[PDB]
């Protein structure tokens, strides 16, 4: 398990693409209404991490609660077929299953899992807790109408002289989402989330956008990963007073942002040196 409480600002941009498809209630880049600032759900980045770990580790003790063929209760009832077949006395049987799928699933060690679903296998608090990535400046979603030279369904509206299905490719022309995340040692005690699991998580935040590429999401990158490694299990300083260190603003005169060169990521590690380590992993 880890022994230092990391609180990290993970700045990631989208150069031209749909960062987090969008609310599913809508599909134009997930925005904060009032500010127009784009949102990227914590679960979206958690999925980028999950996909990165799934492609990279391809290992036991690092499985994921996988993609489409991902009936989770299958993977949970699989946990009830180990040393805790039944001899673990339902009270602590769910705890033993929880420990098993912490150990097995890097997903669950890193981010929690509501595993209280199948043969109930406890709930994991997920040491690593990314928050809703909200873009520094209002994402100016472009909503590019695209076409298809091919209709999908043989519907009534797949007409004679052309089969087209216009469709729309929502895209953020650029948006530097900011993902405050918290890695809690107290909840890494409950999963065995290790310093190596956490190095995998940092490697994931840095490199997970270079691999989870898509037509929808365009080009999207980890512009910065400024972790604050507290000296102790507790908080060496209130998390937000640390995230204010990583102050991201538009540059001097850019009215609108087009690239990371339109964003002063001012970072002051002046007094966190008290007991925090500002590990600028991603930039």
């Amino acid at each position: 398990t880890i022994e230092k409480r990391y609180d990290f600002v993970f700045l990631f941009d989208v150069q031209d693409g749909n960062p987090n498809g969008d609310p599913d209630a809508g599909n134009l880049p997930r925005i904060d209404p009032q500010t127009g600032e784009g949102l990227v759900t914590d679960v979206c980045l958690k999925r980028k991490v999950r996909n990165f770990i799934q492609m990279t580790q391809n290992d036991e003790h690092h499985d994921i609660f996988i993609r489409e063929k991902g009936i989770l209760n299958n993977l949970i009832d699989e946990a009830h077929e180990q040393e805790n077949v039944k001899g673990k006395e339902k009270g602590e049987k769910t705890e033993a299953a929880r420990q098993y799928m912490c150990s097995r699933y890097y997903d669950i060690r890193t981010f929690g899992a509501v595993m209280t679903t199948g043969k109930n296998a406890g709930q994991v608090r997920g040491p690593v807790q990314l928050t809703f990535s909200r873009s520094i400046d209002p994402i100016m979603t472009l909503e590019h109408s695209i076409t298809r030279m091919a209709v999908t369904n043989e519907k009534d509206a797949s007409e004679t002289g052309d089969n087209r299905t216009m469709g729309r490719k929502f895209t953020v022309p650029y948006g530097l989402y900011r993902c405050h995340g918290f890695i809690s040692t107290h909840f890494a005690k409950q999963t065995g989330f290790s310093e190596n699991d956490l190095e995998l998580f940092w490697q994931a935040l840095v490199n997970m956008f270079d691999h989870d590429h898509s037509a929808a999401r365009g080009q999207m990158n980890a512009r910065g990963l400024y972790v604050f490694e507290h000296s102790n299990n507790l908080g060496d300083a209130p998390a937000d007073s640390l995230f204010k260190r990583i102050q991201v603003v538009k540059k001097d005169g850019v009215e609108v942002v087009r690239s990371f060169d339109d964003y002063l990521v001012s970072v002051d590690d002046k007094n966190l040196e008290e007991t925090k380590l500002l590990r600028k992993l991603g930039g």
């Binding site: 599913d24 134009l28 925005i31 209404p33």
Partner: protein, 124 residues
Amino acid sequence: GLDRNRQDIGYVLGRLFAVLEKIQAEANPGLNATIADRYFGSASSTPIAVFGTLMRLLPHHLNKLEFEGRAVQLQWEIRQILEHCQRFPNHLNLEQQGLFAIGYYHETQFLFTKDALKNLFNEA
């Protein structure tokens, strides 16, 4: 059960979304994911998010409407609704949160009551 002059921004946006989906569902009635199925979640809560895109998306439905006068019928009540919408609110108030669903189903009733829109248009 439709206050066409309610002025409650949630209610007028619900009405607006109801007519928007009415047009989409008359543009191509065979439709997997109407804007209720894909946009309503935020149209009810974040009208600025969708309702901009809902009206990128609207003139094309009005085109796809088979009965070209039916397009005028529905566009007219979109305008009737939007007189009451001085702005798509950033986030719908909670009162307005519910009144959006109220508006969706009030205006959806008004559209699926047989002669109502074709009548009420002819008094304009």
